[PDB]
Design an enzyme around this catalytic site. Sequence first.
Site, PDB file in Angstrom:
ATOM      1  N   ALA D  12      38.296  37.073  33.135  1.00  0.00           N
ATOM      2  CA  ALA D  12      38.058  38.235  34.189  1.00  0.00           C
ATOM      3  C   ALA D  12      39.480  38.953  34.390  1.00  0.00           C
ATOM      4  CB  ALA D  12      37.450  37.688  35.508  1.00  0.00           C
ATOM      5  N   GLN D  15      40.368  41.114  31.284  1.00  0.00           N
ATOM      6  CA  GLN D  15      39.638  42.109  31.191  1.00  0.00           C
ATOM      7  C   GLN D  15      39.844  43.450  32.045  1.00  0.00           C
ATOM      8  OE1 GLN D  15      36.695  40.828  27.597  1.00  0.00           O
ATOM      9  NE2 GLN D  15      35.458  40.806  30.083  1.00  0.00           N
ATOM     10  N   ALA D  99      39.663  25.842  29.977  1.00  0.00           N
ATOM     11  CA  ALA D  99      39.265  25.218  31.172  1.00  0.00           C
ATOM     12  C   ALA D  99      37.865  24.740  31.472  1.00  0.00           C
ATOM     13  CB  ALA D  99      39.997  25.636  32.334  1.00  0.00           C
ATOM     14  N   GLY D 144      37.666  28.272  35.023  1.00  0.00           N
ATOM     15  CA  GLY D 144      38.550  27.221  35.238  1.00  0.00           C
ATOM     16  C   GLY D 144      40.216  27.843  35.357  1.00  0.00           C
ATOM     17  N   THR D 179      28.765  32.625  34.871  1.00  0.00           N
ATOM     18  CA  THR D 179      28.563  31.780  33.549  1.00  0.00           C
ATOM     19  C   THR D 179      28.653  30.321  34.119  1.00  0.00           C
ATOM     20  OG1 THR D 179      31.253  31.480  33.790  1.00  0.00           O
ATOM     21  CG2 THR D 179      30.122  33.433  32.523  1.00  0.00           C
ATOM     22  N   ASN D 206      31.279  40.474  42.767  1.00  0.00           N
ATOM     23  CA  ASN D 206      30.629  40.859  41.641  1.00  0.00           C
ATOM     24  C   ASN D 206      28.961  41.386  42.024  1.00  0.00           C
ATOM     25  OD1 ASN D 206      32.354  41.086  39.335  1.00  0.00           O
ATOM     26  ND2 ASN D 206      31.647  39.215  38.515  1.00  0.00           N
ATOM     27  N   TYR D 224      29.933  43.957  31.810  1.00  0.00           N
ATOM     28  CA  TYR D 224      31.372  43.668  32.399  1.00  0.00           C
ATOM     29  C   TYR D 224      32.228  44.850  32.199  1.00  0.00           C
ATOM     30  CZ  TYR D 224      30.860  38.536  32.845  1.00  0.00           C
ATOM     31  OH  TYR D 224      30.722  37.250  33.352  1.00  0.00           O
ATOM     32  N   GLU D 254      54.466  46.411  52.851  1.00  0.00           N
ATOM     33  CA  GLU D 254      53.520  47.343  53.868  1.00  0.00           C
ATOM     34  C   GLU D 254      51.933  46.952  54.017  1.00  0.00           C
ATOM     35  OE1 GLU D 254      54.085  51.644  54.303  1.00  0.00           O
ATOM     36  OE2 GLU D 254      55.757  51.391  53.206  1.00  0.00           O
TER      37      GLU D 254
END
Lengths: 351, 54, 418, 438
Positions: D12, D15, D99, D144, D179, D206, D224, D254
């Site tokens: 994620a 991409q 992972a 993971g 997933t 999502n 996606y 800031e």
Amino acid sequence: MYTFVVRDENSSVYAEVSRLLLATGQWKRLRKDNPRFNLMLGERNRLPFGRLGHEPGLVQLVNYYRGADKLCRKASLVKLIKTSPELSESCTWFPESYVIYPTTDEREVFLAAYNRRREGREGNVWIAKSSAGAKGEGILISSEASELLDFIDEQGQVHVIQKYLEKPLLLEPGHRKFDIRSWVLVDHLYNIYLYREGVLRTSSEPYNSANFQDKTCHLTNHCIQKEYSKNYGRYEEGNEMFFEEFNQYLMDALNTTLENSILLQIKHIIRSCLMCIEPAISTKHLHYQSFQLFGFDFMVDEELKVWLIEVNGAPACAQKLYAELCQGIVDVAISSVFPLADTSIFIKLHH
Amino acid sequence: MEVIELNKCTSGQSFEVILKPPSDPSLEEIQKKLEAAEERRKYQEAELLKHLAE
Amino acid sequence: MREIVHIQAGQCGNQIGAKFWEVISDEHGIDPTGSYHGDSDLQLERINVYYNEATGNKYVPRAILVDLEPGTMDSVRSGPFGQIFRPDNFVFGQSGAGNNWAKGHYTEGAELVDSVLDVVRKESESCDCLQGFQLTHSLGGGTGSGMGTLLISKIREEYPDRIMNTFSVMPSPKVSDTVVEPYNATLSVHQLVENTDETYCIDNEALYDICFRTLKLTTPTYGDLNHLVSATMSGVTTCLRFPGQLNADLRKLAVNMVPFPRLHFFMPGFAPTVPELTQQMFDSKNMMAACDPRHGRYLTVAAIFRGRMSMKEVDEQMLNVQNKNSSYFVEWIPNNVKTAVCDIPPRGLKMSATFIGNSTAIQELFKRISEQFTAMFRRKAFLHWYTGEGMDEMEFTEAESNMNDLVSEYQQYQDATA
Amino acid sequence: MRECISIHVGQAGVQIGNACWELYCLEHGIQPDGQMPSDKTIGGGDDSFNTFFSETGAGKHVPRAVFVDLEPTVIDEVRTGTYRQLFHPEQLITGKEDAANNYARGHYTIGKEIIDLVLDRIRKLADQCTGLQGFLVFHSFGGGTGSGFTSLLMERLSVDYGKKSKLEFSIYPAPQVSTAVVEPYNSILTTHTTLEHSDCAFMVDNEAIYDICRRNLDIERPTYTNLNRLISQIVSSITASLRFDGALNVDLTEFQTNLVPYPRIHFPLATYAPVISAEKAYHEQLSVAEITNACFEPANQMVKCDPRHGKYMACCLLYRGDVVPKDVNAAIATIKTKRSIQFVDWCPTGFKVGINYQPPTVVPGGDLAKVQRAVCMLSNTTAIAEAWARLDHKFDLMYAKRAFVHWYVGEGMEEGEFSEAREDMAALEKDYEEVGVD
Ligand SMILES: Nc1nc2c(ncn2[C@@H]2O[C@H](COP(=O)(O)OP(=O)(O)OP(=O)(O)O)[C@@H](O)[C@H]2O)c(=O)[nH]1
Ligand SMILES: CNCCCOc1cc(F)c(-c2c(Cl)nc3ncnn3c2N[C@@H](C)C(F)(F)F)c(F)c1
Ligand SMILES: Nc1ncnc2c1ncn2[C@@H]1O[C@H](COP(=O)(O)OP(=O)(O)CP(=O)(O)O)[C@@H](O)[C@H]1O
Ligand SMILES: Nc1nc2c(ncn2[C@@H]2O[C@H](COP(=O)(O)OP(=O)(O)O)[C@@H](O)[C@H]2O)c(=O)[nH]1
Ligand SMILES: [Ca+2]
Ligand SMILES: [Ca+2]
Ligand SMILES: [Ca+2]
Ligand SMILES: [Ca+2]
Ligand SMILES: [Mg+2]
Ligand SMILES: [Mg+2]
């Protein structure tokens, strides 16, 4: 078929709504924490509103409006009345009332007006109430401010003090006090439906102006008159008088209708209360939708002026009317969103 | 409705709009954390290899 | 680049395994010579998972074929694709196992196992990043059962941090062709409980009923039963052989499917509109383990659709079966049904739907075997053939206790509430 | 000029990073080969866009970005994508075993093996910074690598760069695109470990992105790429102040001072409008008051919650395109008439407003229509705690039975980290309650 869950099992109304939905043959009941439900008949406290509307492929509906507490509790109602421009601190139909905490607080506000009418020797009997108390306790009436919040610093919950209705419309035969309960249903579209059938919950002993001591001439709650009452049940069964007979009494005894004489004030108070909070609780474009059944409590003075005394967000019905109302809930609040296969009992209050 | 701290340039504008005024672990501790996890893993692999040797 | 090593042991394992390589070779466009001649190039993006690439872009299955008698492995070398396999990966004996788990695990199989792990070790070191192993075998015999689980235990010792998968043909409730199958099955289950990460349970009575009742084959054969299995083995491994992301490797699939380490025995199903498939995929008559799912609850479920279809409909239809049949899914594992869709369909079909359920109803299979095992072991019937190969009686007791414990665990979680 | 380094962790994170950087290049006029024709400071510059882009002597403009994943499938599509020549292969880092949707495996097992190489390659980018602001970290909660390795890196960045600021863009897990069954565990474990190292975290559920794409772009089953293209928009409007001239949110510091008066409550809600489908023949533009009013409708938020039932502590309004301060204060005044906007007593009831005259840029072929005025709202409302309540409950249901826990212990984590992490978010949920509730 549709699914629903039950999370407050001691609700008389929605206990019967559950039974009627199952008799549908089109609704099945999962149990408490199965999240794959269409409708949640939820608990009264800390209902998890944040977990609704997040189940893919399921339109979800709940029988409570998040935020309706600010109207259904005394401290909150008075803050709502006095701080909302739509409802005015100069509100005509709500009794002079003040929020006061034991031990943001209008206690010096309260006695400013107290002495103001002592100077004019006008009626100076007030009453203090709370949300925690029940059973006609945690309630007190008297003429001298001094020991009525001598009496609530004696407790540790927030209580309100409220000018007492000293000249109420009193039923005869009896010379007795009464309350009016009206049931209102707000559906997912925020249509305000008023149940055509109300009830006068009555006192069965003459109203004694002279002393506030015994709270069965004063407090029309169903239970104190069932519980510390000789003649509970003489004039009407269960101290329940319904609108048809009350209408006939006002006609015969004062030459006026119920609709004219009182109902127009009730409908006006309901519209004003619920439209004031619509921007804050409407679920029109929310990921879940709400409905809720409220119970409004009014009192009538001798000049046929109606006063609101509180709103109940988890109300009980009267035994004679559970069938009719509970099925109205199904047709208007539930089957409105979840259609089933194949006159009216409510008054719509437009807005 | 005050409009304070207005700044302008060729690319755009910025400002504030008031409506109503008011009323960590050490690096050493980190690897000690990752070594205690690596210890527990190999203690587990060892007990399995001993069990399989049995 | 995340390679798998496939092993097939015993007659059943080598037959099922052989047809498995037929099905997925055609899917990846490999011909019996080992040369590619396919249409798309998703056929080759993850071909390295199951095939070693060799000279002249000849693709050789990373497959090892094992038996204690040469007969069945002559048949595969004779079969349609018998020539695709690396001839050095045929590892065979001559004695046989005599339907005797002890012979396969301790004596006859002991003599041959180190030659098998010699081939396994050469395959594994030609792997850029070995993922794990998968074995096909029967539990009712002696080689796939006894020697199959010896190979597993020896492989875990050399590769303790790699995934171990099995496709395991289990005894059937009513049908048997050998007297001592309860002993062999129970002794192997005890091994699988502790040394596999995922086991797909298959029995022949269910496979037969599908063939006879559904696909209306008048006289089904092991060959028909075996095409069924190989078709569903292709399905359950689609996400490993074609570009995707849900359940894309063996460890990720295991993490999503095994909430508790011992409950890793799965119910495979297969089918055959989109509302059609998703109803089939969940019907008892379409699963291959002779356990009815309505007698338990799903701890997890993996659904794989193949072909070109409105994934909007598939997403909508699976949601409807879950919300329609919530009673059969544990409420304390949120969102325990996962869906994958691959565009390339199986041959003959256009839209596939293969099912992988981890249901507590698998309890019934282990209780069937436990009841048979006990009825024999209480009288020590036929046991002298096992203690005659050196086994202790306490090995049978321990295996019996562990399979009974497994049944109690399944019931524990069948009952749990939120 | 002070620089910012972006770190993209996991699938994620990577991409989404690659959609953000393509969008930055179109906004600044950089080509796939790193050439900026509009840039007349060759091989150098202290322009505000140089906060995100380095410069070679040859005239190429290199993102100050590092991409890391513990499997190579995703990052290699960057190495082969249309913006491949943008990066140096040293900015892209690959493992080979990921992972496995297991926090403990990305944090302890594999993270230990690779963390020092990632810090080295980060350090090489920090070395060519004259005055580093901090880092923007993109990752998922459920992965993971996204959860496990990200929290380990934040712990290490808090010591190698103890003073620099760290901002998060985190993908909150939604079952319609998720997933793994274990994403609730991974979300809670990384939020607890990361919380005291993050200065400000913008979380994107999502689910909300998914249903916006369905409802407003008429995509029946969003991908996606569709999700990331909309996400990049919201990200770009949030980072635009760092890459363009202005006086609001010109520094990572800031963001915290304007939006985060409470260090633990560092999760601002983002709301974006207008999201209009590009194939709809056309639409009549929306007002400044209309898109501004859309910013209070839950259907436009990155996280679906009800701000009416909480309290604000800060609110920023980031406009892009044809907008002027007059129309804004008109919309605000009229919108406070009809909306329930209650600030905390301890804070002023106000809006910081920024306007950039460059109308929003859209990717060619994308599903979003070119508009001429857009707005993104950053409000720190306690209502976002609804998202923690949802996750904490899913965590609770599975953990009561220790479902899947053996996968984490097997990696060397102790069961006690589960209870520890859950108690932290129990505190957080209660902190949110004392602030925004009576
Ligand atoms: N919006 C968006 N979400 C994504 C994307 N990729 C993965 N996700 C989400 O992130 C979760 C899965 O985490 P990943 O990022 O794929 O996992 P990872 O960080 O690569 O970690 P491992 O693969 O387990 O090593 C799910 O909730 C997905 O919905 C993406 O490109 N965009
Ligand atoms: C209505 N529910 C009844 C289910 C019938 O289940 C089954 C399964 C099988 F696997 C077979 C089968 C087949 Cl298909 N092919 C074979 N080739 C050599 N043997 N053998 C088979 N069985 C051996 C034991 C036999 F023949 F001695 F019986 C079979 F006949 C019925
Ligand atoms: N300002 C006032 N003047 C006179 N009588 C009053 C009053 N406020 C309340 N009462 C009376 O005291 C009674 C009890 O007050 P209250 O309605 O608030 O108790 P409660 O909360 O138990 C009602 P419920 O059981 O329906 O919720 C009322 O029935 C009403 O008749
Ligand atoms: N599906 C299938 N099952 C088989 C086949 N051969 C044997 N079996 C099953 O396995 C048992 C016999 O095991 P077998 O493979 O011959 O024993 P092994 O060679 O010692 O491993 C019986 O219960 C059969 O149901 C086959 O070709 N296909
Ligand atoms: Ca010998
Ligand atoms: Ca040797
Ligand atoms: Ca320059
Ligand atoms: Ca710090
Ligand atoms: Mg009450
Ligand atoms: Mg990954």
